[PDB]
Structure 1
């Protein structure tokens, strides 16, 4: 039984240590924050991507056609799965920030609005990380889930076991990371975030020679219903902020001809717990 708060965006200042409460005190596990962006803004950014006047976002669309036709497509390289040099990731991330800033037209700016939310919920400065030579990480990527596609079950803290995380681990507290995302467009059915009470467990994972074999077993656990779940279908402009680092989660298959498009990533404390970093 994971515990999520449902508040409005005008209420964030009433929860000034929410992020500390989720990560450090562990007194609840996530929150939905309604209307972080206006619906008009979501519809505007959506039309930019549909029509192709997207500031170049289309140039960093990764269709993932080598992962099968059941996988999400993504604008921008996600850091998960990147090689530890991060060269291609840093390039896509610069393109992403410019395209994103173009599409949002400051009405409101994506980075500014997301940073304001995280600040209100922590009382701390908020920053996008920079690489060892000053390269910018991306604040977010955009996931595009067409009809019949899903995001398979996974857990966020596995990032801390990947070579892509090497540099980020020098800046981070190494406690749980949170997930955050905001729908731009929502599908007619499906496309639901499901979060399970099954937790990240590197101890169990180390008994497997191939992580794929370990995930095949996680899939059996969650499909046996042994684990409790909660499920959410935020609307356009609502933000979902949750302990995806600790808890396995997935997004259910999209149904119908309207794609699910979501913008988001992750956040976590700095080494000394005196700043919020956020990235994708």
Structure 2
């Protein structure tokens, strides 16, 4: 059984060990934090993307057409699936940070507001990681799901098995990463985050040839309702923060003409749990 807290952003300082409780204690699995950003700010940013006065965000839009017409588009490169050098990732990350700061117009600033939230929920400093040669990681990416598009089932801790994670693994604790995201725009129907009770299990995955054959068996448990699940659909400006590192999750197919737009990434403890890093 998955357990998600629901509070308004005004209350976050009353939960100073929430991130510790999700990752280490595992007394619960996620939170909906209502109104981290005002509705007007979300609309403003959405309009920037739609009109094109987006601080150069459209210059780093990846349509992902090579992976079919059934997948999310993404502004900025997400680190998952990148080459170990991260050269393209770092280039797009710098642009993403610029454009994001421009669009939010400090009302409130995206990075400041998100860092404020994570700080309140942990009592710890919060930082965007720096690359081997001083490059900035991106704090977030924006995912765009048009009508009929979805995000296939996956689990966050698989990132640790990817070459792209080489550098981050020198900075992060061994524990679970969390996912965080905030809708900019929400669809008419569908586009729900579905989290399953099925957990990350590298011992079972290692007893297969490739990940496609293992994921087929994971898919069979999901399609047969063997695993318990909960669906979430946070509103614009609400943050959804959960143990995506541990639990398999997906975003259901978008229904209607109105696209689902979400800004977010991941977070995890530093080696000594004296700091939180966040990135996408």
Would you say same fold, with TM above 0.5?
yes
Output the CA distance in 2 between the equivalents of 1:120 and 1:148: 37
Which contiguous aligned blocks of 4+ residues in structure 1 show a shift greater than 3 angstroms?
A: none
Shift of 1:215: 1.1
Kindly provide the CA deviation profile for residues 187-227 of structure 1, in whole angstroms up to 9, marking residues without a partner as x: 00000000000000001101111111111211111111100
Residue 31 of structure 2 aligns to a residue whose secondary structure is strand
Question: Which sits farther off after the overlay, 212-221 or 133-142?
Answer: 212-221
1:95: Cα distance to partner? 0.3
Paired residue total: 280
Q: CA deviation at 1:155?
A: 0.1
Structure 2 residues without counterparts, runs of 5 or longer: none
* Residues 19-63 of structure 1, C-alpha deviations (whole Å, 9 max, x = no match): 000001111000000000000000000000000100000000000
Deviation by residue 1:220-279 (Cα, 9 ceiling, x = unmatched): 111111000111000000000000000000000000000000000000000000000000
Q: 1:133, 1:85 → 2: CA distance?
A: 11
Q: In the alignment, which residue of structure 2 is the partner of 1:208?
A: 208
Question: Distance in 2 between the 1:150 and 1:43 partners?
Answer: 22
1:80 and 1:103 map into 2 onto residues whose CA distance is 25
Distance 1:227 1:129 in 2: 35
> C-alpha separation between the residues in 2 aligned to 1:260 and 1:48?
15
Cα offsets for 1:102-152 (capped at 9, x unmatched): 000000000000000000000000000011111100000000000000000
Ranges in structure 1 where 5+ consecutive residues have no aligned partner = none
CA shift for structure 1 position 66: 0.3
Whole-Å Cα distance in 1 between the matches of residues 138 and 212 of structure 2?
Answer: 28
